[PDB]
Design a protein around this nucleic acid. Sequence first.
DNA 1: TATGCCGGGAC
DNA 2: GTCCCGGCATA
Length: 33
Amino acid sequence: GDAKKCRKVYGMERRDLWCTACRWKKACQRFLD
DNA sequence: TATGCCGGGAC
DNA sequence: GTCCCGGCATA
Ligand SMILES: [Zn+2]
């Protein structure tokens, strides 16, 4: 929904700024839900 | 079109 | 251990 986890924050042009769960398309370890 | 995730795949 | 996508649930 209206949430903003790593990928919707930084985008694929800044993928290096995401958490390692987001890097691997697994449940976010940073922006908990 | 695209986030966000499990099941499956790579080395 | 460290690395990621295909297909799906979902909007
Ligand atoms: Zn994350």
